[PDB]
Design a protein around this nucleic acid. Structure first.
Ligand SMILES: *C(=O)[C@H](CCSC)NC=O
Ligand SMILES: [Mg+2]
Length: 314
RNA sequence: CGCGGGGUGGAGCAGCCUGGUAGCUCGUCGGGCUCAUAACCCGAAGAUCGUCGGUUCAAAUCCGGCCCCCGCAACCA
């Protein structure tokens, strides 16, 4: 019985779950790697990171290499003589020298059912593209991008009310659980790797505010998904008087229209119906810059002029 | 030292600049009316204006300290 010496590499809260998990699970995390502290969030104050914060607390060795391309840095890994490196939501890329350093190499917890949604935003993209389900996949990291053999998976269906925040939460339960279970297999040698079927390969491009800016050209349905896939970030928004209004909730009304997309059709307690490339999107919850999310009703009771029927939104 | 908006009956807002004067659009309850209504009309309840203190005959308004909320940006992948 020797706990696998583990190097953990992660940044966001999603990683923190996995780390906190390994610890409470009784593993030996020799070192932790995150992104270097930076300005973040009104005031641009130097903020730690979700992962680091947890580490500091647990009194774990932190390593914040700006990159792992540099020899000096790649050494920080090998100097730890680890059995395996668990990677989860880590910005930095891992050079071949590093992937080979751990006795068992590096394994990554990917938020998608590979080979599908290889990339940076598999969670949001899955929900965005309409997928019926999603989940994690613990993989042996190879070279490139999420190309390594897959060891373990766990799936969960995507409801129709799930945002990306809720999907993250759901996978924050499966993830660790899958990670642990796989690490034991790795330790016992009972790991049974699979190879990726290149035909079923789709990539999950990162998110951006531009893509978030509501595009009425798109079907009401694609937007309905955006409005949920882009939550909590960046949040589907539309511009009103050179102002960003974030759209939190929007149902889809199924009754076609020939009006030019962006055209407001109705505006009542039931929501603000707007024409789209196909179908009519029905804004139910909007957030006026500097305010909170509110109901179409609450919003119309003071900005009725923002959504008058006949007018058009861009 | 990053830029910026906001905290007023239950809800969304105006009122502040140029001190007195409680507004607007709704919700709620009662009544009126229609075949009926989520529609209209009339009435009512309901706010020590975020908090503490100062000027003041008098403060939502002008001055100071504080707590809270949000937008950009930044950040995470
Ligand atoms: C980011 O580059 C990628 C997505 C993580 S899935 C939450 N993996 C990082 O380790
Ligand atoms: Mg109040």
């Amino acid at each position: 019985s020797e706990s696998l010496r583990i190097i953990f590499a992660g940044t966001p809260d999603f990683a923190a779950r996995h780390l906190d998990a390994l610890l409470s699970s009784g593993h030996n995390v020799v070192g932790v790697f995150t992104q270097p502290d930076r300005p973040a969030g009104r005031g641009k104050k130097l903020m730690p990171s979700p992962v680091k914060v947890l580490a500091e607390e647990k009194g774990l060795p932190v390593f914040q290499p700006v990159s792992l391309r540099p020899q000096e840095n790649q050494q920080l890994v090998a100097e730890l003589q680890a059995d395996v490196m668990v990677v989860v939501a880590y910005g930095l890329i891992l050079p071949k020298a590093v992937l080979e350093m751990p006795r068992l190499g590096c394994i990554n917890v990917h938020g998608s059912l590979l080979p599908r949604w290889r990339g940076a935003a598999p969670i949001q993209r899955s929900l965005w593209a309409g997928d019926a389900e999603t989940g994690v996949t613990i993989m042996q990291m190879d070279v490139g991008l999420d190309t390594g053999d897959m060891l373990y998976k766990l799936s969960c269906p995507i409801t129709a009310e799930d945002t990306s925040g809720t999907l993250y939460d759901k996978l924050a339960e499966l993830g660790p659980q899958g990670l642990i279970t796989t690490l034991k297999q790795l330790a016992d040698g009972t790991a049974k790797p699979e190879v990726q079927d290149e035909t079923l390969v789709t990539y999950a491009e990162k998110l951006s505010k531009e893509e978030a800016r509501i595009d009425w050209s798109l079907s009401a349905a694609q937007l309905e998904r955006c409005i949920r896939a882009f939550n909590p970030w960046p949040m589907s928004w539309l511009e009103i008087e050179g102002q960003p209004v974030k759209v939190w909730k929007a149902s889809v009304i199924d009754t076609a229209t020939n009006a030019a997309p962006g055209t407001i059709l109705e505006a009542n307690k039931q929501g603000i119906q707007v024409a789209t490339g196909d179908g009519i999107l029905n804004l139910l919850s909007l957030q006026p810059a500097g305010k909170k999310a509110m109901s179409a009703q609450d919003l119309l009771n003071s900005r009725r002029e923002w959504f008058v029927p006949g007018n058009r939104l861009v």
